[PDB]
Symmetry: C2
Subunit: 178 residues, 2 copies
Amino acid sequence: ERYRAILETAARLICDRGYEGTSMQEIAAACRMTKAGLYHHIQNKEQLLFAIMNYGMDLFEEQVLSRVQDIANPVERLRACMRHNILLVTRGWSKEVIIILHETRAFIDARKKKYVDFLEEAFSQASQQGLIRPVDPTVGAFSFLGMVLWIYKWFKPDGRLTDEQIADGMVGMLFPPF
Amino acid sequence: RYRAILETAARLICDRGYEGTSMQEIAAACRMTKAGLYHHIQNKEQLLFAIMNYGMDLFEEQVLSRVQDIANPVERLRACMRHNILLVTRGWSKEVIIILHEGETRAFIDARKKKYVDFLEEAFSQASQQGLIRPVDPTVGAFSFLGMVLWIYKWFKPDGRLTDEQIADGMVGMLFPPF
């Protein structure tokens, strides 16, 4: 419990002022610990970032992939996955962890590729079964990911559009009745 | 010569970071004296705003000026998307644009960015009302377009399986098919 709290706090600080502009002393004080206490849990800044990103992938698999991987119809699977990814970004409890994850290298890269593989497989199946307009599966996957992963840069919760309207509109754009 | 400086600086900033990169290092990468650099840019704040303003100039020069006269709004969106993907992927412009999206100066750039979004929203509005695209909230349309296109820098390489043109043909076909 104390460790995940450290990752969440560090992630919030890193998102506010960026990686270079965040010190381990800043992170320690934000966690109500001494710098020595922080280093009991983490080895240095580079490992902290790795830990944040791995925790991010865990959270994503639990809250997005776990829920959709058993949907057999590939366009239903895509539609649910896109809606879950959007709502993760706008409603999630660890938004800054997720931002760092998509914004040791080889270990995280291979984990991220599992999601790209999943999307490409579904676009492939949906295209083949006549449930979506044909498209190259990679073009589909990365259009999907670009639409969802950009949200945090523009979306203002106090603005006109609601996050449910964004989810409905986005899904309807890529995956209309076809 | 000024634009070459900004492109060289954008390269270093993307490779070493903004805090890592110094005006002395920029001068050396430009093969200029510190005095010659200083004539164009005097500190790092000035440099950053200059690069971001150059990026918005590129949206005008490489995208808007090429499409703004297309009367049919779906044809306009299809051309705008293709030009924008090229601006994101061309070696000479790609790092300027990355920096653009990665106090009072913040509002001056924000206002320029919003003129582009406004343009996309007007085209989505016209195309939807005219039945040339499936109905969509114009802001949703605009930022779906923007996310798709700007995120290309995260995964594109010029020796990848898909060319830039294949990516554009495919993206335009997804958002703006015959309808």
